[PDB]
Ligand binder design. Sequence first.
Ligand code: NA
Lengths: 538, 538
Amino acid sequence: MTEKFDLATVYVSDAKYNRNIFFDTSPQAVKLYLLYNHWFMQTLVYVFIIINLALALFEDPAVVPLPIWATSTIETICLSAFTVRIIHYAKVIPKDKFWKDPKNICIIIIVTLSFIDMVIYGALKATGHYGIRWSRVLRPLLLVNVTEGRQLRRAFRSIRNALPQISYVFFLFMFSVLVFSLMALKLFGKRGLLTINGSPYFTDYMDIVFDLYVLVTTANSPDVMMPAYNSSVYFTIFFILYIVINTYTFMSFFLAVVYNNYKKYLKEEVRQLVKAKRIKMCRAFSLPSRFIRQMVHHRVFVYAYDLIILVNAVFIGLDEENPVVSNAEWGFLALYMLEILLFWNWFDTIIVVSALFGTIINSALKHSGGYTSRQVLDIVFILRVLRLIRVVDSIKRFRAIINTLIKIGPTILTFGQLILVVYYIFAMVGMELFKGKIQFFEPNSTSPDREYCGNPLLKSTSFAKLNYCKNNFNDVISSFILLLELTVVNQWHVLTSGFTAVTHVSARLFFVIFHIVVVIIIINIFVAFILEAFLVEY
Amino acid sequence: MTEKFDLATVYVSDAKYNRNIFFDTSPQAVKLYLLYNHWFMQTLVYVFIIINLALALFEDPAVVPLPIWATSTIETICLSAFTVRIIHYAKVIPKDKFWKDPKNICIIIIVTLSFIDMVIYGALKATGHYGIRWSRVLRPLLLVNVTEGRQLRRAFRSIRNALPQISYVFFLFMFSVLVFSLMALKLFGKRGLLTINGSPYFTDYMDIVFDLYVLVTTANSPDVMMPAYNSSVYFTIFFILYIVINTYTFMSFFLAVVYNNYKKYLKEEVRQLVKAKRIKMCRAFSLPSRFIRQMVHHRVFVYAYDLIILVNAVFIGLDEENPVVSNAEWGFLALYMLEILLFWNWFDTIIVVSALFGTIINSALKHSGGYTSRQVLDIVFILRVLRLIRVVDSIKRFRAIINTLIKIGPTILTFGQLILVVYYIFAMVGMELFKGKIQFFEPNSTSPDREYCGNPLLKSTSFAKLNYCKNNFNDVISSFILLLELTVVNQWHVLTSGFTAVTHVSARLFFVIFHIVVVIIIINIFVAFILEAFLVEY
Ligand code: NA
């Protein structure tokens, strides 16, 4: 009636959410909900999470060194924003189900732990303990256990359900690796002959099992077997079997398990949100020449601009800065500018107006200071070749991608932050162990400081003399890059062998665990998506 | 009646086949069918195909050099066996549908071409033409287009149907690679600065597109970007985008397409064989102490032998040939031998009797000639650690694998020869281009013959000084090994860079095409199986 109508609106206006609220009895206790779910607070909590995360750019290893008093008073207001949001949520939900939700317990827990760690990082006269801030790994868990993370903490239950099977299979896989390592130890071994390059080939077991594990990841496929294939071809059979048993059978059994669990949780996000919709949504019931320019387009006219684009991609990859081509970049700019004579019309318009910034080239190269020569060209040419993507219209296959790019569809946003929660936890953990062991040195630097590697323990390794030096964990920027080239598994064993040469050999576990959680059950949860999105879309 | 009963039997006795026969009118024209489909002829044609294939061990580059008159009179009888089988088949099927089948046209075609090439390899006074035998690539096509290859030539129609989609997607993928290569050429480029190691980084386009293609295959993930990440971190964004667009999105779109087509052809092998069954099958209608040893087993007794096995895997990986352990290998042999006091009982019995060949160790080490010391141990120890696989019973998960290993189930046999048809076609093609360019040299050989690489064009490359020398195409054995480490894609660009350094740079197409057909649409057709076999098995 006079106020139940509003309760009805707030029950119906969520044709997408999934939760229970306080059914209004005090007329401000539903206004507090309407303010809670209000888009601006929903984006304010996310920008406050992003500030809290990106605080890692400044703190212990910093790309921008900021004083501790200054990078603590930022996450003090971040944690205060989370506290004010959680007490406001408690003012929305009655004090019956607020206390039971794990999400709320976890939120107040990680806020309390971050706030206690922040002040116990009151160093107390430089008692720096050579590594602190054990709560930075809890920062990306706000991204999950926040009230708006229903799209993520649901996608975390999908993995929580996959573990009694992923581990069920990984036990068999690690047993295969361990029995194959025993088989290879009784083969070429301490009771064997051959070497690799000044090293004994397969002599100790704990190095065999790692060299055989990394062969599953095929980071060293033709090199781990090149001795003992230089010795006898019959040794090859061992690796032929190992690869087809582990690299292809097991590493695809993990994908099968991950895809099965994803496919099984998709029908329990839907059909459990659908029932979570009709609960409330149904409860509301109980609660001249101008004619010519108009007709040229719907003709052979896109074929004229699919050729002008094509001849434009030939006027790009031939530049030697001759008047033939240095002026022609202006003509093509005008040709698309008439396309302003009425998906792509959204994208196409963005590029042409951004390409009209070739005037900046005129106003910043021949005069007015040419100090920004390479930078502005590397941003206009990366933009001209972006026009080229619309030449794909000639195949009639990109007006049908905005459906595969369906409206915003936070699924690709959910994974985009799922890879962040994992990277941030490993970057934070990683950069406290290998904080400043190796370091990229400028090409003209103090060579007597051992500039060819960073520190003499990489005196002659395959990490040095391969220019891997900007892969250090010395800051969250160059530590997120490293975790990429660790994700894409090429030569992850030599990146590992550069961090187990400056630290103990046990650091091998940090990168093995990383590969297990990222490449086996995070990249596969990605392939499981663009597999599911491809088959069941009809 | 008097003979229709036999026609009825031969129509019913095939509860698994799919074909039409001659309905008997001349009483020998169905006896010829019964003899045709007779198991012995069916295995004789396959051993004759295997002889014809394995003839490559002897012919042009040989592991065993056999005279041309002698390795031609073997495939003369092989082609005669195929001719006698095809004329016998023509004597089975009436001369109406025999001539129309492609399979028959293709069989007589490849037989005629092999037989013409075999005699035109009547060299005519050493006119060797530096490479002949253009019909060896047709040898593995008998494996497909033979009458018993219905399990394979059907699995080839699955790929023939996937091509209008795999190419549909590969066009977009190669366009992405080509536009990204243009974007990287206008980036760090001839109008750029940086180098790699004495080389210019990304200057010419046809090398950028290959270095960017191989980055999709992630064979050079952290090395292709290490310069221009040693120059500016903002260049990383380019590769971060390239990898997530190509390495993970496209390379999984290929898997999605392959798996969709496999899943779509599975329901057209079944439900088209099922209708191919009820056609004929229904047409038949119209046409004391002994008590103790008996009861110890069904008790805690497998737990006693799951521990004896466990302590046996500790009595294996500690051997230093002491009397403690050199005798203990006999005791464990006896312990399992009592397990002969009544899936595994099949497998377990095989290992224990094969492990009783430790008597050969006694009769061939301490006396009677110890010239076979390493060889017989490397075959008994690879066998003891095979006992260990039954310790998996303690998890209760391998009596349920003989269902995933269902009765013979030629599907895993169909793929096992599908990888052979592809390898044999590339080994035959490959070993006629790079026949003897590089060659593995023994560790004590004529160094002045350029033994560190094989030939001076690999003077200082990453193919030499990495011990890649037994990867040559110099014989079908070491050419099938190479195509494995080409299949498992680690460092396929440096194996390529060793063959494009002895031949023209255009040889890059042989390995790019190989990766496209093996890693993209053959390994994915394998993952599509153990994905399909895992989900739809209920
Ligand atoms: Na790789």
